[PDB]
Amino acid sequence: GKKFILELIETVYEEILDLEANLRNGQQTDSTAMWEALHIDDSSYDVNPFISMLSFDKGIKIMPRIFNFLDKQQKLKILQKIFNELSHLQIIILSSYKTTPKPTLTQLKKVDLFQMIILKIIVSFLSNNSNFIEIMGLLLQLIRNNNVSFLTTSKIGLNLITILISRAALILSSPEISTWNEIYDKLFTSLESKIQLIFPPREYNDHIMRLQNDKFMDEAYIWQFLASLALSGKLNHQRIIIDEVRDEIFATINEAETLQKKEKELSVLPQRSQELDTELKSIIYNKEKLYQDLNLFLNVMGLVYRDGEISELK
């Protein structure tokens, strides 16, 4: 229960602080006490205690400090534990536009903190003497133990996937290359015909917009995901991707062009007030942003939107 997990987190901070005082005072560090404090090898509960800790702000806040006193095998086991349970985590449930269609500002902040800390940790683990087979194993754990599609309805799940595949791509035996093909295929099959769902619905965007007093959204992470999915696949995969997100391409082009006209009508006004000036700068920034993020994906496909057309590259 909640009071139990809170007591657990308290104990963990005490272990970390003792550990951190030792390292400062030059002397011995032994992470054995802190590791046990995590209850990572504890099957005695409904939800694993360490996992439940991750849905408290104070629990997630101590994760980097925990990783400072861990070896790679301990690091891997933790990430394995997490990847296993991803789509069940309370914070992921908060993160998905499906399970949480009307988040509060506070819930958005909790979500942002989680993905900020967790992603950085996962990234640093992959950037630090990590091999292909490690990454593959993590992707495969992700795919086989989760509703992959449900994960793609969260910024966190989407970002996690594109980090994993982009780290895969950025990297080797022939069986390893083949392993990547099998895994990509598994990932791809899990998403086939559900790709457009990565785009939250209009009701959700309107809600977020009203919430944050902002006329615009930021979906760079969505197009980034598509670009990396497309770059990691073969020509038939790319074909299937561009087909599933067809209407999103058109809608994006449509919005950009609507911005282009509003820009043209404000641009020719002399001595713009502060309000009109901030508005024009906003229009321009957002127009260019839609072009840029859309072209990140199209360029991968050998395509470009420029002067009212999707033309071939060069």
Residue numbers in the entry: 474 to 644, 654 to 796
Task: Give me lines lifted from the publication on this model.
The Pat1 protein is involved in different aspects of mRNA decapping activation. Hence, Pat1 is considered as a central platform protein for decapping. Indeed, the crystal structure of the S. cerevisiae Pat1C shows that this domain structurally belongs to the ARM repeat superfamily, which mostly encompasses proteins involved in protein-protein interaction. In conclusion, the crystal structure of the ScPat1 C-terminal domain has revealed two functionally important regions localized at opposite extremities of the domain.
We therefore cloned the ScPat1C (473-796) domain, over-expressed it in E. coli and purified it in milligram amounts to homogeneity. The SeMet labeled and unlabeled proteins crystallized in three different space groups. Only structures refined to higher resolution (crystal forms II and III) will be discussed in this manuscript. Three and two copies of the ScPat1C molecule are present in the asymmetric unit of crystal forms II and III, respectively. The crystal packing radically differs between crystal forms II and III. In crystal form III, the two Pat1 molecules of the asymmetric unit exhibit a very intricate head-to-tail organization with an interacting surface area of 1,635 Å2. As this value is in the range expected for interfaces within homodimers, this suggested that this ScPat1C domain could also exist as a homodimer in solution. To investigate this possibility, we have analysed the quaternary structure of ScPat1C in solution using both size exclusion chromatography coupled online to a triple detection array (MALLS) and small angle X-ray Scattering (SAXS). MALLS measurements on a protein at 2 mg/mL yielded a molecular mass of 39.3 kDa, indicating that ScPat1C is monomeric in solution (the theoretical molecular weight for the monomer is 38.6 kDa). Furthermore, the SAXS experimental curves measured at various ScPat1C concentrations (5.4 and 11.2 mg/mL, i.e. concentrations closer to those used in the crystallization experiments) clearly correspond to the curve calculated from the coordinates of the ScPat1C monomer but not from those of the crystal dimer. This SAXS analysis indicates that: first, the large contact area observed in crystal form III is created by the crystal-packing and does not reflect a biologically relevant oligomeric state; second, ScPat1C adopts in solution a structure similar to that observed in the crystals.
